[PDB]
Copies of this chain bind each other. A is one copy, B any other.
Amino acid sequence: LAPRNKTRVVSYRVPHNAAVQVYDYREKRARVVFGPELVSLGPEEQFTVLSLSAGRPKRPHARRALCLLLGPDFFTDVITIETADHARLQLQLAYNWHFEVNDRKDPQETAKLFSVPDFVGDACKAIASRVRGAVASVTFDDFHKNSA
């Protein structure tokens, strides 16, 4: 609403069950902060911006963030499958996910949380394919009955 003072050290409150990635281009030094803390950019430090998939039928590049929500949530997708009988089906699915973080002090592991650019659409399409494959080898009646 009001132009921020640019001479003020830039801070960010990181929400619970999340993490940000910040790189220091002067001191050439990386860090990832976890959880409910406040993070302050140095003179030349920067945030990573995560561009993520969102929408009913998930589209890439619909959401942008600075923190990675690590914590247990779900996301929901609408698929279109087809049976060995050519019965065209439309599915409403939901995926319960979370990030195992073995060691939070480990700088090699902790950077991998940010490897995959769009971890939402990655798991959507990678699962939406596993589902379209098994079901073309299954018939309609069998699927209407054992879909679960």
Contacts and interface: CB of A to CB of B under 8 A. Distances in A.
Nearest to A38: B25
Nearest to A76: B125
B115 A72 contact: yes
A4 interface: no
Interface in A46-82: 46, 48, 71-74
Contacts of A116: 72-73
Contacts of A145: 84, 136-137
B122 A74 contact: yes
Given A136-B145, A145-B137, A146-B137, A36 B16 contact: no
A147 B133 contact: yes
Q: How many of chain A's residues touch chain B, expressed as a range? A: 35 or more
B23 A125 contact: no
B133 A16 contact: no
Nearest to A125: B94
9 contacts: A13-B25, A23-B36, A25-B37, A74-B125, A94-B125, A132-B148, A133-B148, A136-B145, A136-B147
Contacts of A46: 13
Interface string A1-36: 000000000000100110001010100101000001
